[PDB]
Design an enzyme around this catalytic site. Structure first.
Site, PDB file in Angstrom:
ATOM      1  N   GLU A   1       0.851  -1.106  -0.109  1.00  8.97           N
ATOM      2  CA  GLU A   1      -0.027  -0.069  -0.162  1.00  8.97           C
ATOM      3  C   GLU A   1       0.873   1.229  -0.113  1.00  8.97           C
ATOM      4  O   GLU A   1       0.692   2.364  -0.727  1.00  8.97           O
ATOM      5  CB  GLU A   1      -1.024   0.169   1.249  1.00  8.97           C
ATOM      6  CG  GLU A   1      -2.032  -1.276   1.353  1.00  8.97           C
ATOM      7  CD  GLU A   1      -2.462  -1.508  -0.023  1.00  8.97           C
ATOM      8  OE1 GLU A   1      -1.957  -2.223  -0.648  1.00  8.97           O
ATOM      9  OE2 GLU A   1      -3.629  -0.987  -0.251  1.00  8.97           O
ATOM     10  N   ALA A   2       2.034   1.325   0.766  1.00  9.68           N
ATOM     11  CA  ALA A   2       2.807   2.444   0.897  1.00  9.68           C
ATOM     12  C   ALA A   2       3.549   2.683  -0.541  1.00  9.68           C
ATOM     13  O   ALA A   2       3.551   3.653  -0.871  1.00  9.68           O
ATOM     14  CB  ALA A   2       3.708   2.385   1.874  1.00  9.68           C
TER      15      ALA A   2
END
Ligand code: ANP
Lengths: 54, 178, 59, 53, 96, 200, 41, 48
Positions: free
Chosen positions: F193-194
């Site tokens: 996600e990052a």
């Protein structure tokens, strides 16, 4: 499939390692790229062969 | 004769792995043990709960476990038997057992394999096979509809395939919880 | 059973009694449907029996 | 009785059920009418001629 | 021959009936017939016919009736006076 | 639900019954549910169609049929999809008007949620604009369920009211769901996600 | 072309009716043709 | 007419009737009538 039903547990790995797949369920959102061209298929099947030989 | 066992001897301790949903049975057990304390504010009890789960989950004993916790008259027989090969006597057992319950209340009725009566009438089978099945299932409908919450009798149905149930037994006020 | 046949019989008969008249069956599709070769249900029995009566009366 | 109960039930079940029009519905002194003729039908010239004749 | 008992034989599909419930009645009849002649052995060839699984056949009503009636007959069977029931079939896994 | 049955001709019987009693009690309003499950295309299909469409055509001879009229009663039917209904049923002359009922709008939700709170003990620091711009996409029954869970969680919490945060949680649980995940798998989630967020 | 005996009976009956519509009690040849023309519209 | 023989006529619909105990008797009746009236020819329309 036209399935069945049995009194068995889950297979050692092949049915237990099938937990990581996420199959397709609805028909109108299925993707299938155009099939390779028998000169690309050559190189891809050659990669498969390299993995197996290693 | 209907299989009515007086006091059960099956406990809430001798079934395991269903604690989260078990609360429902425990709550119902208080309502039926003390039918007047829910007449306090009018909390509506279930008309009858159909126990659902694919076979081997124990749908029969955990109902009989409710029966053991309450020591109430437990009424059990197979729904499939309500369609023996003679027309008109299938519904006779239904009425017999329902008046037995209305008499020996506070009691709990249990009929496993009733969806054999409640599976949707097929468009491929013989009518003569479905006609008295129709008659028996409508006997059950009208009878357990004629039941009041104040008669102190809880109904328990059991089968494994909920999807094959016909929408008439799927009515709220007939089978409230599942 | 037999009620549909008796009904078309009574209709056509009393129509023949007050001749000349007009009969009008709207939507004979539900009664004049082609007889199949499959299906042993009572509904087919009564439907084609009414069909037979309809026939023999009109001819 | 015991025998003609089912006779009555039968000929009730097996009665005529066609609505009768243009006969004297003189239960009260009427006769049932539809109230449309070959003038309030505009378009099927060929069909109206066929049924006229 | 080593049980000193009586031997009884029939076939499975013998209980399949074009008449509803007569399978259940004949199940009852066979069961009481063997009950009154205890002890004995009751061997049933063609067993997978009656002992077929549920839903896997087009005979839900009939086969369901057969199996539930036979089980409730041998469920409450506490008066086993030395008898046995030997059902023979080729597919033990397709059993109910 | 009481129109679907396999015995001989009873569907048309109940149809004639409903319609003739509505004619006797006329004027009236005959509302009928479950129309898509019965009013499907007349064709061969299964055996049930020898009965199923039978009932249907009895239906067809009650709306217009013969008799040229009865009173002018209103017949209304609820169905999910119009494209599946029979051709004769949907024809101008048997169902004159056709209106759509979509999911509630922005102001639709604004009003539908606030008319659903006079039956609720609520506080005064409530601005329905946040909920209307926050509950976009749900149906009315889901808004009523949101209020139901709000009241029940207010009871299970020990309070007497429900304010801003209360509703927010309720709708956040009704929308984004509510299982264990190891701390080893959790870092995979975090890394992917990052990375997607940094790229975008 | 393409007819059957039953259709021939029906067509001569239609011709009879077409002549009767013209008031003539003697069916003429054109009635035959007239049949084909009224089936068309 | 050319064979110069009596003629009878019937139809499939008749003998056909869903209630019991009729068809066989009607068929036997037709055939015994024919026999007693022979020579003959029994035209029966829509045999199917
Ligand atoms: N959830 C459960 N927890 C504990 N034991 C269970 C459970 N479900 C079934 N059993 C066992 O199943 C046996 C009882 O089976 P039985 O009396 O035949 O009812 P059942 O057939 O298993 N219920 P059903 O699947 O609806 O027919 C006992 O040995 C129980 O211990």
């Amino acid at each position: 499939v036209i399935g069945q039903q049995r009194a068995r547990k889950v297979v050692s790995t092949d049915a237990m390692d099938a937990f990581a797949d996420w199959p397709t369920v609805s028909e109108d959102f299925r993707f299938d790229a155009p099939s390779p061209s028998d000169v690309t298929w050559h190189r891809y099947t050659d990669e498969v062969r390299r993995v197996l030989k290693g | 004769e209907a299989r009515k066992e007086g006091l059960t001897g099956v406990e809430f301790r001798d079934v395991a792995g269903l604690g989260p949903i078990l609360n429902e049975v425990v709550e119902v057990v208080e309502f039926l043990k003390d039918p007047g304390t829910f007449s306090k504010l009018g909390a509506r009890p279930p008309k009858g709960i159909l126990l659902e789960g694919d076979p081997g989950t124990g749908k029969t004993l955990l109902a009989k476990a409710l029966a053991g916790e309450a020591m109430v008259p437990f009424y059990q027989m197979s729904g499939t038997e309500f369609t023996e090969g003679i027309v008109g006597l299938g519904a006779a057992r239904v009425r017999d057992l329902f008046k037995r319950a209305r008499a020996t209340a506070p009691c709990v009725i249990f009929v496993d394999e009733i969806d054999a009566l409640g599976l949707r009438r097929a468009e491929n089978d013989s009518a003569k096979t479905n006609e008295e099945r129709e008659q028996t299932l409508n006997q059950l409908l009208t009878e357990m509809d004629g039941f009041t919450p104040d008669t102190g009798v809880v109904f328990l149905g059991a089968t494994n395939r909920a999807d094959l149930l016909d929408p008439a037994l799927m009515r709220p006020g007939r089978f409230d919880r599942k | 059973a037999g009620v549909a046949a008796a009904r078309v019989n009574s209709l056509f008969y009393n129509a023949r009694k007050k001749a000349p008249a007009i009969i009008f069956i709207d939507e004979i599709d539900a009664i004049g449907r082609a007889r199949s070769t499959l299906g042993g249900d009572p509904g087919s029995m009564e439907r084609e029996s009414a069909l037979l009566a309809m026939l023999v009366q009109m001819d | 009785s015991k025998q003609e109960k089912k006779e009555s039930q039968w000929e009730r079940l097996t009665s005529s059920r066609a609505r009768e029009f243009m006969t004297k519905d003189e239960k009260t002194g009427k006769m049932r009418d539809t109230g449309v003729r070959f003038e309030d039908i505009a378009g099927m010239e060929f069909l109206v001629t066929e049924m006229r004749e | 021959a080593e049980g000193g008992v009586r031997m009884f034989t029939c076939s499975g599909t013998d209980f399949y009936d074009v008449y509803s419930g007569v399978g259940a009645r004949r199940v009852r009849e066979t069961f009481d017939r063997l009950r009154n002649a205890a002890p004995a052995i009751l061997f049933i060839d063609e067993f997978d016919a009656m002992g077929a699984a549920r839903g896997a056949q087009a005979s839900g009503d009939e086969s369901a009736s057969i199996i539930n009636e036979l089980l409730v007959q041998m469920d409450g069977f506490e008066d086993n006076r030395g008898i046995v029931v030997l059902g023979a079939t080729n597919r033990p896994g397709a059993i109910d | 639900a009481e129109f679907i049955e396999m015995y001989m001709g009873l569907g048309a019987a109940r149809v004639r019954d409903l319609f003739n009693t509505a004619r006797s009690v006329a004027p009236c309003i005959i509302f009928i549910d479950e129309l898509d499950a019965v009013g499907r295309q007349r064709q061969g299909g299964g055996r049930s169609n020898d009965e199923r469409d039978n009932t249907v055509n009895q239906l067809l001879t009650e709306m217009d049929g013969f008799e040229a009229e009865q009173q002018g009663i209103v017949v209304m039917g609820a169905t999910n999809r119009k494209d599946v209904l029979d051709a004769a049923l949907t024809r101008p002359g048997r169902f004159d008007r056709s209106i759509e009922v979509r999911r509630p709008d922005f102001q639709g939700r604004l009003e539908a949620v606030k008319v659903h709170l006079r039956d609720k003990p609520v506080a005064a620091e409530i601005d329905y604009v946040s909920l209307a711009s926050l509950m976009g996409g749900m149906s009315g029954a889901q808004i009523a369920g949101v209020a139901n869970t709000a009241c029940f969680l207010a009871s299970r919490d020990g309070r007497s009211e429900v304010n801003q945060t209360d509703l927010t949680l309720a709708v956040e649980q009704a929308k984004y769901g509510r299982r264990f995940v190891g701390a080893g798998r959790k870092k995979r989630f975090a890394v992917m996600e990052a990375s997607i967020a940094l790229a975008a | 072309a393409g007819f059957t005996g039953a259709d021939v009976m029906g067509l001569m009956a239609r011709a009879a009716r077409m002549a009767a519509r013209q008031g003539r009690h003697a069916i003429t040849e054109d009635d035959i043709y007239a049949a084909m023309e009224n089936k068309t519209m």
